[PDB]
Design a protein around this ligand. Sequence first.
Ligand SMILES: NC(=O)C1=CN([C@@H]2O[C@H](COP(=O)(O)OP(=O)(O)OC[C@H]3O[C@@H](n4cnc5c(N)ncnc54)[C@H](OP(=O)(O)O)[C@@H]3O)[C@@H](O)[C@H]2O)C=CC1
Ligand SMILES: Nc1nc(=O)c2nc(CNc3ccc(C(=O)N[C@@H](CCC(=O)O)C(=O)O)cc3)cnc2[nH]1
Ligand SMILES: [K+]
Length: 185
Amino acid sequence: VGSLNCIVAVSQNMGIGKNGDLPWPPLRNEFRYFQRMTTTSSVEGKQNLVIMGKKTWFSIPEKNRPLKGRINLVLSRELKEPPQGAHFLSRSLDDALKLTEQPELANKVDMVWIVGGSSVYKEAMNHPGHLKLFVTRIMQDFESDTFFPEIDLEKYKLLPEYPGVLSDVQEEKGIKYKFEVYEKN
Ligand SMILES: NC(=O)C1=CN([C@@H]2O[C@H](COP(=O)(O)OP(=O)(O)OC[C@H]3O[C@@H](n4cnc5c(N)ncnc54)[C@H](OP(=O)(O)O)[C@@H]3O)[C@@H](O)[C@H]2O)C=CC1
Ligand SMILES: Nc1nc(=O)c2nc(CNc3ccc(C(=O)N[C@@H](CCC(=O)O)C(=O)O)cc3)cnc2[nH]1
Ligand SMILES: [K+]
């Protein structure tokens, strides 16, 4: 796999989660952005793969699992088999990427998206070679118990724009946010 994508939404205090859910009220267009970015593939015959930790999997409402139109892979050191509805299970990020090149997934996976949580992001972001980080900056503090680190501008560049990503401040339910894209090579 020659590129990875991470996608995350963060509060001003770097929060991503609280009590097994998001720290903020539901932002429907932000969710639709997540859906669009992770699902969209114009390569006929293939789907994108989403990789996530176990707590992130159980944080998705059961009626939306597995995430439709995507191959869903969960990371766990304890399971077993994939949780009910998930397509695949791997014991590490390295194992997950290796799995995509084996016969079952060989001609089936287009883009790989890392969708959380904290550990999965940390390792992906240190992974050699090309990485893009799609970061939604929610422009408020929210009480949180799970966090995303400050991005190191030594390794990553904030792209001034990116095709298909809106550049202006967004607002839903009185909450302002903006879509950012970072890249390292
Ligand atoms: N705002 C946002 O963009 C997002 C928010 N969230 C929020 O974050 C919280 C969940 O994230 P977090 O608490 O970080 O948990 P994770 O989703 O990362 O789940 C943690 C568990 O996943 C497994 N795991 C994680 N990394 C690896 C690895 N590299 N290899 C093998 N197994 C791994 C382990 O399972 P085991 O113990 O079975 O080994 C671990 O205990 C929730 O509040 C959720 O709502 C989640 C994603 C994005
Ligand atoms: N940008 C971004 N925003 C997030 O909310 C987000 N959340 C997580 C993990 N949490 C979740 C929670 C629910 C769903 C979910 O049910 N998504 C469905 C419905 C989308 C919609 O309502 O429009 C999906 O089909 O993607 C996805 C990820 C990871 N990266 C993110 N990245
Ligand atoms: K496709």
